[PDB]
Design a protein around this ligand. Structure first.
Ligand SMILES: Nc1ncnc2c1ncn2[C@@H]1O[C@H](COP(=O)(O)OP(=O)(O)OP(=O)(O)OP(=O)(O)OP(=O)(O)OC[C@H]2O[C@@H](n3cnc4c(N)ncnc43)[C@H](O)[C@@H]2O)[C@@H](O)[C@H]1O
Ligand SMILES: Nc1ncnc2c1ncn2[C@@H]1O[C@H](COP(=O)(O)OP(=O)(O)OP(=O)(O)OP(=O)(O)OP(=O)(O)OC[C@H]2O[C@@H](n3cnc4c(N)ncnc43)[C@H](O)[C@@H]2O)[C@@H](O)[C@H]1O
Lengths: 214, 214
């Protein structure tokens, strides 16, 4: 099973990735988690990407395409994978298509910009694992603490409203066109395409996704 | 309590780290000590680090970050730790930030560049214990002998006028920028920052630090 999750930065796609990963027994390929992992490790890519990410701008297509192509070629992706935050540009999508990679499902999460800005104020993360919570819509079982390690949660410096708005500008200009890209691919018989209302509660979005994927 | 010690080569951070460990009950995390321990074991890391350290050069960010991650995951760091010689580059500091590793205090040891070659050239060590002396400024009770074991003191290969001068240059370009980095973090309320006069006698510097740490 191969799946692409499409949606605005902050729409909640990553929260639903765990449910999908367990359903098909497939790994999550999140370019955001992978770039943040490079920064935490002190890799050369981490050194190159940090300033770009802090500016709320997209990392160069060539760097991300090479990172994803290497990740997909690994053993744990041979029986399927979930792309979460990739592709984010028409060149990233064309790179995968030209390489001969088709997916089974493209799932779009629709959430308006102002709801995202309001929502990200409450985003709290376990930086080491990438586990994400929301103080109100998806709270940790213990306030301020990770459910698995019990370690203090953090607020990403990149979640300042100004940087949230810069990411949403990049999204509408460079990423929103992938809705038409994959709707066309679905009409060509190269994938299935479905859209969910990401404004609903986490449990309701999960059930909608369960009905689409059966 | 979590503390970072910043300072020019030979400023006396390691000397003061021992008193902060004994007094506040938190472990000293010395990247230099951990690398030298790899050399003493004959590990692959020790094999790759020995000549870099002996030339007075910095070991790769990725390697030191991994060493620190493994050490601070141990249970003896639950209630705090002292980072002595880490971070030493902006990528190491950004790695800590991305991983949500907050600190309570950043202490900068201020010593003029003119005093560095003399501070390092006179350094003598008792490797098995970590005891450090200076032939003139902090001498052993018996010339050339460890005060507790009577074992001969040794001189690190990097503690020579040639290397030390090359260290102060790499220091200006790669490590000195952490002063502004943590001064900016402290101005944002993320840590307390304090400058120490490192030219004062060992006992006076120790007093200045006890006043800051409480
Ligand atoms: N392909 C690429 N090409 C180039 N550069 C790239 C790239 N990929 C990454 N980059 C670079 O990396 C940077 C960072 O990447 P970035 O775009 O920030 O990636 P990310 O942080 O992994 O993804 P999102 O922020 O979109 O997360 P999400 O909203 O899908 O899910 P979340 O669980 O957080 O959910 C959000 C919040 O909402 C909450 N929530 C979730 N579901 C619901 C719900 N149903 N109702 C209410 N709240 C909900 C959550 O708890 C949470 O608090 C980019 O800016 C760029 O520089
Ligand atoms: N994060 C990292 N990233 C990459 N590579 C890394 C790394 N961490 C380590 N490495 C690698 O490992 C190597 C070894 O690192 P490390 O073991 O820390 O050695 P170093 O860098 O040469 O030592 P410092 O410059 O930190 O000296 P200090 O400030 O601790 O002074 P000291 O207390 O000794 O005192 C100096 C002398 O002055 C004397 N003295 C001390 N205080 C006083 C005082 N107040 N008055 C007079 N004399 C004093 C002492 O007795 C002594 O003789 C590095 O060079 C690098 O290759």
């Amino acid at each position: 099973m191969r799946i692409i999750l499409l949606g605005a930065p902050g729409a909640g796609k990553g929260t639903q990735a765990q449910f999908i990963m367990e359903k098909y027994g497939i790994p999550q390929i999140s370019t955001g988690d992978m770039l943040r992992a490079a920064v935490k490790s002190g890799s050369e890519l981490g050194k190159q990407a940090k300033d770009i990410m802090d500016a709320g701008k997209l990392v160069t297509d060539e760097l991300v395409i090479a990172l994803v192509k290497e990740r997909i070629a690994q053993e744990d992706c041979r029986n399927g994978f979930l792309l979460d935050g990739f592709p984010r540009t028409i060149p990233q999508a064309d790179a995968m298509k030209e390489a001969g990679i088709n997916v089974d499902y493209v799932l779009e999460f629709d959430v308006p910009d102002e709801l995202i800005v309001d929502r990200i104020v409450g985003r709290r993360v376990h930086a080491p694992s990438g586990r994400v919570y929301h103080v109100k819509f998806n709270p940790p079982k213990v306030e301020g603490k990770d459910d698995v390690t019990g370690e203090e949660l953090t607020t990403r410096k990149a979640d300042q409203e100004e940087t949230v708005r810069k990411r949403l500008v990049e999204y509408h200009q460079m990423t929103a066109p992938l809705i038409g890209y994959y709707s066309k691919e679905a009409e060509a018989g190269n994938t299935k395409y479905a859209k969910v209302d990401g404004t609903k509660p986490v449990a309701e979005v999960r059930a909608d996704l369960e009905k689409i994927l059966g």
